[PDB]
Symmetry: C5
Subunit: 336 residues, 5 copies
């Protein structure tokens, strides 16, 4: 009773050329693509790449695979995949893509009576996601995923998403978990590209990433904020304590300097200033300005002591207000 299936498979492969696409010279091959994201891999800001594991599925029609039998479907595995024609789908932005081969090559092949073919493949794509870190860390990124045929132009093979956008791309509930990003949603699109080898249709999927803040607050902002407050303590010490107030200014200035270096160690070596850089720069000004106030005060503490006390007394109020005021503008500007 099982030998019947063997006869069907042998019959289909008989007089079958896998080097020729279905409907060659008669029509245009149409491929339906659906994607399921098992896990949205880590996003490497330094390398401008993001890893992703998906179950890529393609569907098309091949009249050469029509068959008649008790079962309307023929579940199979990778063994028969190489014996038939499959699209040469590839990822344009994929810097390095590898498959999964354990325990068995993770591929599926199903065939219906009408000749419809389902080809499912598991992939891990290390794609490239260029980013504009001008509003970092209050930045939103749109990492794309482009794929299409390598050898068959639009005139021969066309890719189209199946059903609506929601069914076209699906992300696992636990897969969309990252340490420094929120997966707001996904979008799908298409576009034709003209090349020296002809026109090709491109299927594009974009993932909306909203960076989650809180790591940089504990790592960069808070040390900068508390460092500024530490400098302002010098305003409450007597002028004659030259050495004491010198330690506050010098130590704080160096502390802010190393924080800027440390902050950008993890950040990509971009040749432009970010929002965090401006915040550090302003904080650097406050600590440096406090030291200048002490130097100016200590320079005139003899000739005109009266103004020296007023400046020191006034500075106790002005500096905290300006720094507090700056934060409201800074946070409101980038959080709105």
């Amino acid at each position: 009773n099982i030998t019947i299936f063997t006869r069907i498979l042998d019959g289909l492969l008989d007089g079958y050329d896998n080097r020729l696409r279905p409907g060659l010279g008669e029509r245009i091959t149409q491929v339906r693509t659906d994607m399921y994201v098992n896990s949205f891999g880590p996003v490497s800001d330094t390398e401008m790449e993001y890893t992703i594991d998906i179950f890529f599925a393609q569907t098309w029609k091949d009249e050469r695979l029509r068959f008649k039998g008790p079962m309307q479907r023929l579940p199979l595995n990778n063994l028969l995949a190489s014996k038939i024609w499959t699209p040469d789908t590839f990822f344009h932005n994929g810097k390095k893509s590898f498959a999964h081969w354990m325990t068995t090559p993770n591929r599926m092949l199903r065939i219906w009576n009408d000749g419809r073919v389902l080809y499912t493949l598991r992939l891990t794509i290390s794609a490239e996601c260029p980013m504009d870190l001008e509003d970092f860390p209050m930045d939103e990124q749109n990492c794309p995923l482009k794929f299409g045929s390598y050898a068959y132009p639009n005139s021969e093979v066309v890719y189209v998403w199946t059903n609506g956008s929601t069914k076209s791309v699906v992300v696992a509930e636990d897969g969309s978990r990252l340490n420094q990003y929120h997966l707001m949603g996904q979008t799908v699109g298409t576009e034709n590209i003209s090349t020296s080898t002809g026109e090709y249709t491109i299927m594009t999927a974009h993932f909306h990433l909203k960076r989650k803040i809180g790591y940089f607050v504990i790592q960069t902002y808070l040390p900068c904020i508390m460092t500024v407050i530490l400098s302002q303590v010098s305003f409450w010490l007597n002028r004659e304590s030259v050495a004491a107030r010198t330690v506050f200014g010098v130590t704080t200035v160096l502390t802010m300097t190393t924080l800027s270096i440390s902050a950008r160690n993890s950040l990509p070596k971009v040749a432009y200033a970010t929002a965090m850089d401006w915040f550090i720069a302003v904080c650097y000004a406050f600590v440096f300005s406090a030291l200048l106030e002490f130097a100016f005060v200590n320079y005139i503490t003899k000739s005109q002591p009266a103004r020296a006390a007023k400046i020191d007394k006034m500075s106790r109020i002005v500096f905290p207000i300006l720094f507090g005021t700056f934060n409201l503008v800074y946070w409101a500007t980038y959080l709105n």
Copy 2:
């Protein structure tokens, strides 16, 4: 006398199709799985992955492999594995799995007269273990291991553990050794998942991890604890020693700042506060508060010296008690 074995193997492969599962269109294929963990690989908290080396064994029934001979069993190797049908088992959460091929592909194949087949394979799985580091380092993790068929739905292939849970999964005595985790135990479960390609049965194995503390005590807590004690020494110095007490406060505050940065370098860049972070924050408050006490004392050391001495004298007792009291609450809360 040895040629008889050759005839049996040749006979079994004659008229044998490896593209068809046993009992196709007649019943549901049942697979029994047993796992032995040779060594529980390192757990990468930063990458939320854990490596594991196992001897994965699958058992099923294939009536096409029945034979009669002097021996009831036919020990073999990987040579015949590709000549017969094997399940397309794969790991859903396996980010990257590779086999061992030296000296010979580490696979075993045994066949009995009744047609029962044993297929053993050695694997190294780099699975993903999402973690909730809210109670870190007093956190317990449950790293799973999910596997199942890729192409054969529940209606065709079903996986079930063999014997009891203890025999189903086994961990070597020396294998369960990690630098920062205790392998409390293992659990096994099953569940059906509905997909666009049909329903699939999933075999799940969970490993209970109890983080072992002592590295962070020597690396993070103790430096923080001793740093706080160092700051409190300033309370025992005379007020007029402005520079001396300034060094204690400034140096300690910066020391705590760098400890927080250093502590999170190894820790994953999670966007939320951990138990260790709160401990550091409280320790930061004590050192910062001590400096504020000195500044306040030095500010009123002229107008009202009487209160200045009382505050300094009182602070010698209050600060150690509060810090000691906090530790009891902190340790008891997270250790109970």
Copy 3:
């Protein structure tokens, strides 16, 4: 209607030897090469290598592949690539080159009636780009890309660019994006090399890189500049404040020392001085010189106080002017 294509392909391969180049012993095989750079990978200054992803295309004439049919072209895939002769093109400067195999080997093969063959391949080349970091970071680099035949000398196989230089090499608009380099343009050239195995023609492509400054300004120059300004503040303090002015000089000198170490951590370990190194060295002299001025002033503050005040007063003006003057010369020299 589709079986006709099968007959053509079978006919071409009949009596076809892929071990022999077309026109062997009758003429010289001519290959036309065109390159499209999908993305100019990162440039590793430390390893003197740059990654690049290209769609390498080769065109040549093979009279053995002539055919007659309704279609003037035969789009195909990698399946037939191994069944015919292709040039043994390789990259001389490619330290490690790997192909892309997912979902299908990214190769294309097209054949015309006249026998013209188009062979397109996707590659990721980790080539070597030696650099002369004498004007770093104001340095311009010319990273080459050399390729040619491995076994067929100039007398048998010759490579020539197709059409003009612009069409010969093309770079994607978004591909030419780097964090620390600007892709000014590309150039193409040729040259014959004499070897023990014969003369070979070499096709060379050079990419002009103009390093973009701004990361080192925020990371190295500014901390050095502000550190120097910090030292000059000591000139505005009274001489009797020995400890206060000592902190400025000592802290600044050490700060500059660690900046030099930190700056070269990312920079390659080249055994010669760069422009940035000279800038740091000069900045180190200013901070060190300021400390020497204080030591000299403090040494003569008793015997001849009159000159001590003049030196301290004069130093307040001389030092800022010289440092400001140096920057104009430094920046103008390397930016012109």
Copy 4:
């Protein structure tokens, strides 16, 4: 005259089944193993693994390979290795093992008239070496190397070392060179293991490693020792110099704190204290105790100056003696 060899090889493979072990169902296959260690690779303490490159040789008897000819031996290469039966030897503790394939697969095959077979293979094994770092760096490690059959139990295949232990395992004179270990010697053993798949014989080789000290002396101990001596200098300064003695105590305490952090950066993150940790802890006590002495002295320098001088004078002698005494006990205890 050379065609005779071709006939012999063709004859042996005729009617030969590589899926069946020699002497199947008639006796037990006996395998003789000899190992030569070309180079003992680096030992990764952090990953608890050690690399090793060996020329693994196996010898066994196969009556099916008997032949008669002018030559008593048939040197060969990897070409015939896959055409005959070879044991499925694998390394139980090998986390990742790979072969060498350049220029040609590094394998040898020799056959004698009697049917004896020699199979030599070159391997690079990244095995796991669990370590007990309780006496670190005065610790001795015993890294094992376990291998055996994967599919053939003890009842079918048995491994035994050839000749004595010295000939069984050999290490190259220059191979046994490590930066932080001495290869004292090697030992070989055997043991039977019972599994669900049957009993298997295990061949075990242990390498005795004696860690060589001198890097940690220059990196950890000496900075700690000199730091303690630096703190004791404060005892020779006058009490009224409050700021001066404060710098010694504060700087030394922080210096010891960072040394402990730095020391464990390279060391594995083990959750227990090592001998080096105790040495650092004691050194931390001395520096911290010195600061406490100054604080206590400065606290009573007014009411009872007489005792203050005695304590400071006495401390100059007590502290060096105790620290010197501790070293003798510490070094003697762990070096004996």
Copy 5:
């Protein structure tokens, strides 16, 4: 006219056994080896390995490949390489060697009428270069490159360099470029090794490396030199400035301590002292000695001030002279 070549190749392979070396049982196979180093890869001091890319060429005589035709030579590619016998050459010291496969396997095969065969292969060898870092950084290294047959002893296969030493090994002009080494020259040698499997001839190539200094001068020596000079500035300050001179001594001592730690971070963790270590140790003595001078001076500044001034005045001259004198001896000793 091209079919003639096909007949020749088919004829040669007819009745050809690739498992047998040429001249088997009749003479000894002689192989001529020539090497061209395209680029001398980076030298990893930490891992004691150096990468190298070469075009390895082997020449030998095979009477079975004699042919008659219009052309005296048959240029070919890797396609025919596997169809004939090639030596099993391998690198004894090669820890990991991989080939280049893009665009086509980089191999060449040429055959003459007499039967002479040329086999050229491109390789990237990560060999091991043990080093004696006793004179580091004034050290000269001799990195070898050993290769020979794996299965064919000296009695069957013998390797000999072709022509003179200069032609035997060739290094590209631009290939011999390293950041911290000078490629002085190359030497070639031979030697027979006795093994359990027989005697084998070994072809050895040594590369003379002269480390180029200048990176460590800017990274280690200069900071140490300037740090010592900074300490000597304390001798020019008044004794009563206890805090001021304390900062110089304490800061300098710690600065030297961290420099030693930083210097060895890149250096391999060798368990012995290098020349740089001695230089740092001496520099550490000068800074530490200066602090001791201040402590001794401050201890006797009351009882016998006269000697205190003399010591401080004398130290201003003695210390610079000794440090300057030491450098001349140090540099002359290791540079001569």
